[PDB]
Amino acid sequence: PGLKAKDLIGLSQEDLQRKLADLKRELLSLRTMKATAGPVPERIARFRVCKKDVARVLTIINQKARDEARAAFEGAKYIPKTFRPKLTHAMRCQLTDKQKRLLPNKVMKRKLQFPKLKYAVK
Amino acid sequence: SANKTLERKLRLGKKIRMNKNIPRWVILKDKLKKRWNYKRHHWRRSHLKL
Amino acid sequence: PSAKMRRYNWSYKSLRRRTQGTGSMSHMRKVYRAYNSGTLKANARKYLA
RNA sequence: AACGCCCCGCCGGCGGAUGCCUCGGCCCGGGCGGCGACGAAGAGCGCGGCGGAGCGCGAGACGCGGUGCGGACCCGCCCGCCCCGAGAAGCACCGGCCCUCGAACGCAGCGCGCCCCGGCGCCGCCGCCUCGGUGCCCUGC
RNA sequence: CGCGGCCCGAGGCGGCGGGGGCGACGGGCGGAACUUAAGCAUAUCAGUACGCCCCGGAGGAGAAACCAACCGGGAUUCCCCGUAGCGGCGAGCGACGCGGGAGGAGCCCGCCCCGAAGGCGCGCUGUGGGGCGCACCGCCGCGAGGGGGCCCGAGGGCCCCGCCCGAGAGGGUGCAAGCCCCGUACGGCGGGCGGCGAGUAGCGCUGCUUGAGCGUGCAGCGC
RNA sequence: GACGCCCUGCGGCCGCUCAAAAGACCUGAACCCGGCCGGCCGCCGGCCCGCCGGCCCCGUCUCGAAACACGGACCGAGGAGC
RNA sequence: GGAGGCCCGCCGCGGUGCUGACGCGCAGAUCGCUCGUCGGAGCCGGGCAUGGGGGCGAAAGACUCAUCGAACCGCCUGGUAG
RNA sequence: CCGCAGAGGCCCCGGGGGCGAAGGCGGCGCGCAGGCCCCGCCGGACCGGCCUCUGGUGCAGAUCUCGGCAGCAGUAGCCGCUACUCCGCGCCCCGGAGGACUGAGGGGGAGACGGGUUCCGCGGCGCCUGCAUCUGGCCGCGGGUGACUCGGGCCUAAGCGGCGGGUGAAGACCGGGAAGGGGCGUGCCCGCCCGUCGAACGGGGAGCCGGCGGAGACUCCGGCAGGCGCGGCCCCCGCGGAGA
Ligand SMILES: [K+]
Ligand SMILES: [K+]
Ligand SMILES: [K+]
Ligand SMILES: [K+]
Ligand SMILES: [K+]
Ligand SMILES: [Mg+2]
Ligand SMILES: [Mg+2]
Ligand SMILES: [Mg+2]
Ligand SMILES: [Mg+2]
Ligand SMILES: [Mg+2]
Ligand SMILES: [Mg+2]
Ligand SMILES: [Mg+2]
Ligand SMILES: [Mg+2]
Ligand SMILES: [Mg+2]
Ligand SMILES: [Mg+2]
Ligand SMILES: [Mg+2]
Ligand SMILES: [Mg+2]
Ligand SMILES: [Mg+2]
Ligand SMILES: [Mg+2]
Ligand SMILES: [Mg+2]
Ligand SMILES: [Mg+2]
Ligand SMILES: [Mg+2]
Ligand SMILES: [Mg+2]
Ligand SMILES: [Mg+2]
Ligand SMILES: [Mg+2]
Ligand SMILES: [Mg+2]
Ligand SMILES: [Mg+2]
Ligand SMILES: [Mg+2]
Ligand SMILES: [Mg+2]
Ligand SMILES: [Mg+2]
Ligand SMILES: [Mg+2]
Ligand SMILES: [Mg+2]
Ligand SMILES: [Mg+2]
Ligand SMILES: [Mg+2]
Ligand SMILES: [Mg+2]
Ligand SMILES: [Mg+2]
Ligand SMILES: [Mg+2]
Ligand SMILES: [Mg+2]
Ligand SMILES: [Mg+2]
Ligand SMILES: [Mg+2]
Ligand SMILES: [Mg+2]
Ligand SMILES: [Mg+2]
Ligand SMILES: [Mg+2]
Ligand SMILES: [Mg+2]
Ligand SMILES: [Mg+2]
Ligand code: NA
Ligand code: NA
Ligand code: NA
Ligand code: NA
Ligand code: NA
Ligand code: NA
Ligand code: NA
Ligand code: NA
Ligand code: NA
Ligand code: NA
Ligand code: NA
Ligand code: NA
């Protein structure tokens, strides 16, 4: 029952917006029917489907918008904080791996003239 | 009293909506042994402190 | 309105009554799950390297 | 006498010991060692077809989407699914939504501002723009 | 009366940081009394409870202004082993070295030489470079072998005769089940020269602290 | 928790399901109590069984407890030299 | 003419005597008569301030939420006991 | 030495068990005793003789702890607030009739605080209504609170907080000597220095009548008015008196 996001991803923004408007309108109609009279099985059956349909359409719209916006800031120096890589606070505030391996030049020179070798005893 | 803030009024509103029994179809759907809700209150006996 | 919370060691029962783990702990649960079995470590390694 | 009271042989109450059983506790070892202004921990208030408590979730609310696996049910009444895939229950990871308070950030706690275009908290470091000084000088006047 | 440089300050803008949470372990401060002494005031309890502040997956400590007195050792930490001493010399309190193990790793800056060679809107009130002469977890799977009779509400019961075994750990099933079901045993995949730190070290007086005793460590003031 | 029969209704009887009512529930002790049936005052001893003889309330501190010294209505379970 | 920390007296605010009732209470301080005061150093309500060896006191060691010759809560603490 | 719970072994074709284990009740026998054994009834799935090992291992008492429960006993008690009766119909509900009371500092009519749905309609008697109940503030199911003019939101009181900073090991506490804002409109001009904190009784711009429901009314509807803003059209820069 209800729509599928599969064939929903194949519409334009305006079409999805209109679809959402109609879904919300008829959701209000079903709420009125529930509030008055009595809950016949068919309208109550349609009710749950309509709620999840609204959910699905909103999902599709937001995903499309996010993809466009993310493509807008692909190569900038500063991007919105909602697109930066997912990490924790502690690992965000940390030195990278090459910064940890840096050495002063004198120690670099020393550690190159005496490299590690393989040997066996006896 | 008759001169209350909306904040106090909203917390007392939730207490009234929650003072209900266990529905009959719930008791038998879950096969319940104890059929009374012991989180109910009565105005003449309680102190809500809200 | 003090910035810190009122906690005292001479009563471990009140600490027991209100503390971390007595609520939902939504964000902490999600992060712990993503770390123990997930891709948080791979992401961190790629970001640091 | 008799009744009442107190003592044997059967039958009933009241009460809940004992015995047997327990998805619970307690100790020892091992692993892990991961939260937050990108809004934490905690609190409030809401969300179900018929819905009180608890769990869960957040006006997209008793859940939405993607990728794999699974393969007939769905605690009541209903609704739904049924098939060489057409897809119920379940499982893992990933992407989003995310009301009011809260370190809690226009003021204040439920009321009210400034602004011109949308937005309006504090402290620090770096950099830039606009300036002050009978500070040390210099020039012109 | 004006305006340029340097110096010392003020308002705004941009980008980055901080704040709070966590009955353990860890670091730094403040700091009791009950109690024992058969009373009690120094002592003890105790450098404990508790209060405040601050990190991490560990922290702290760490490459000698060290021990020692030997036919010597050689940064730090942790384990095993054991009496000098302090003390109304009462009650009580109390280290270290040598020896045997776990583990094992080394280094820099300033000062001195060059001087923008630099991370170049900064910086000569010093960036950058150098010592100078002699010589183990996770993921995925398959998984064997029993019948007959009696009797019970139901046998996993009783009698007889069998099979599987790298599996006779267990759990479920209408009564004690290797062979009724799930599992158990046996797999695969991914991972000579120059130069050494000042209101410092030390000393006097005072307070706390230690086994440290005409001073173990710290601190205030004066020098 | 069938059916049937009484009942102004409340309820009752008879039976039904089950191996069993095990009927809001395993087993179901003691104290206390109701009915029916047998007896007449506690313990010890003798006996053909109600006669004879003997018998102060325990635990505790204490020179000394039946004490007008203290604790103890009754029953169950727990309860103190590791 | 209409002064007064003047007098009699209602509501209020108090609390004398009966040593009345009650005293397993209506009540962990009440009830009935009788009584003191009643324009003032009077009485009542709300807001605000003072915090524990401290406060506040026309002073009784009084009061500080049934607790005061030193409140209450948790911990030291299963404090010590010839 | 007897007994309790558990561990390691034995129990001659591999200890006893739905042909009935543990536990309960009654009755013999054995032992100086602590105790043990057997039989009958109940019950419905486990149990232990001997050797070695282990311990949170044996109750009459502690003004012992927790639970249950007796006599007393159908006893003490159901004395304030003057009071009910007849008929429908029942001392208590409803109706009519009679008889009384509270007695305008009300057992009346309304608010503040506190309570939080107790409010209204329909139904009911399982609980409660210390007697009863057909009653109910009890139980079930549905409903119910409308503002330009009433109050809060604003002001300030006694007070509280904040304030470049100051102090303290901190937590925190104390605080005038500090380059401390606006306007019109883009350039100029003015200017030492906090608070949209604190009063449903103080200050405050403006509301009356009639009617309607089952439960709301200065709020709804009808009528008649007030106050404060904004937008259009016309649309004006003062005269009288001797003086008040
Ligand atoms: K000490
Ligand atoms: K005595
Ligand atoms: K006595
Ligand atoms: K005190
Ligand atoms: K006001
Ligand atoms: Mg709920
Ligand atoms: Mg906010
Ligand atoms: Mg705020
Ligand atoms: Mg800034
Ligand atoms: Mg002690
Ligand atoms: Mg002493
Ligand atoms: Mg002593
Ligand atoms: Mg003493
Ligand atoms: Mg010591
Ligand atoms: Mg370190
Ligand atoms: Mg198999
Ligand atoms: Mg088995
Ligand atoms: Mg040196
Ligand atoms: Mg000392
Ligand atoms: Mg005899
Ligand atoms: Mg005799
Ligand atoms: Mg004694
Ligand atoms: Mg004595
Ligand atoms: Mg004597
Ligand atoms: Mg005696
Ligand atoms: Mg016992
Ligand atoms: Mg006068
Ligand atoms: Mg007078
Ligand atoms: Mg009297
Ligand atoms: Mg009396
Ligand atoms: Mg003082
Ligand atoms: Mg059975
Ligand atoms: Mg034991
Ligand atoms: Mg006993
Ligand atoms: Mg009587
Ligand atoms: Mg009268
Ligand atoms: Mg009223
Ligand atoms: Mg009513
Ligand atoms: Mg009710
Ligand atoms: Mg008004
Ligand atoms: Mg108003
Ligand atoms: Mg105000
Ligand atoms: Mg007013
Ligand atoms: Mg009007
Ligand atoms: Mg009304
Ligand atoms: Na902090
Ligand atoms: Na961490
Ligand atoms: Na059973
Ligand atoms: Na005697
Ligand atoms: Na005594
Ligand atoms: Na007694
Ligand atoms: Na007088
Ligand atoms: Na006195
Ligand atoms: Na104690
Ligand atoms: Na038996
Ligand atoms: Na014991
Ligand atoms: Na009448």
Side-chain angles (χ1 to χ4, degrees):
Chain A
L3 296 142
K4 323 255 80 176
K6 302 302 154 103
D7 35 23
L8 267 194
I9 70 134
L11 307 85
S12 62
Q13 207 60 294
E14 277 281 26
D15 290 345
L16 289 161
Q17 210 73 38
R18 180 273 343 290
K19 192 89 59 56
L20 174 70
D22 326 299
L23 274 163
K24 263 149 169 18
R25 188 43 185 104
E26 92 92 23
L27 210 47
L28 160 69
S29 189
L30 296 161
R31 241 150 37 206
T32 300
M33 278 327 110
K34 173 177 291 296
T36 73
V40 302
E42 309 74 17
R43 302 331 301 162
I44 67 183
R46 183 88 179 88
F47 201 28
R48 326 188 218 169
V49 174
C50 204
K51 284 205 249 152
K52 295 320 172 185
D53 261 12
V54 161
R56 271 179 281 267
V57 168
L58 277 169
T59 302
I60 296 310
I61 279 163
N62 183 248
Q63 161 78 320
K64 224 166 293 310
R66 259 189 106 77
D67 230 337
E68 263 48 78
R70 195 184 283 269
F73 304 93
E74 79 298 314
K77 186 44 206 96
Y78 305 126
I79 78 173
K81 285 181 164 167
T82 206
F83 299 137
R84 289 153 191 217
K86 187 170 59 129
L87 301 157
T88 63
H89 186 119
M91 72 191 33
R92 242 151 53 210
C93 295
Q94 235 167 39
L95 285 177
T96 71
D97 223 35
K98 60 137 179 88
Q99 279 166 345
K100 295 196 156 134
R101 319 268 45 86
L102 286 175
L103 293 178
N105 189 317
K106 191 166 52 163
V107 203
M108 298 217 219
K109 297 180 180 330
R110 255 212 306 285
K111 94 148 302 206
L112 254 63
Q113 51 182 141
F114 298 111
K116 298 181 70 275
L117 325 166
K118 292 236 260 210
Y119 63 94
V121 194
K122 296 150 97 300
Chain B
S1 51
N3 296 294
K4 61 237 279 182
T5 60
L6 185 55
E7 313 90 79
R8 298 231 292 147
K9 181 171 154 189
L10 286 182
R11 284 261 246 155
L12 292 164
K14 173 180 183 168
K15 267 296 144 38
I16 301 150
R17 305 153 38 141
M18 260 60 264
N19 218 20
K20 298 189 132 11
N21 296 307
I22 307 183
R24 200 87 37 157
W25 62 267
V26 164
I27 275 160
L28 65 65
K29 158 198 151 191
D30 281 344
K31 282 87 188 178
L32 286 183
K33 305 172 197 94
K34 303 94 163 133
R35 52 81 209 166
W36 59 95
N37 173 32
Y38 54 68
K39 299 221 172 164
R40 300 194 71 203
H41 59 92
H42 184 263
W43 59 276
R44 201 147 214 172
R45 215 167 337 286
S46 83
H47 327 284
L48 290 178
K49 287 179 179 185
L50 276 179
Chain C
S2 170
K4 48 165 138 161
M5 308 290 287
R6 181 181 170 277
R7 315 256 74 190
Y8 288 117
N9 287 313
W10 40 261
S11 200
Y12 63 68
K13 305 230 267 293
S14 43
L15 309 172
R16 181 154 87 192
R17 265 169 211 128
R18 195 214 296 126
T19 190
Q20 160 195 121
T22 67
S24 43
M25 211 151 32
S26 329
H27 177 82
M28 279 208 190
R29 274 165 41 229
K30 281 190 298 233
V31 173
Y32 281 44
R33 193 233 299 120
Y35 187 95
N36 287 108
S37 47
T39 83
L40 210 52
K41 268 133 112 191
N43 229 293
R45 238 201 330 269
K46 176 238 91 173
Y47 178 91
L48 296 174

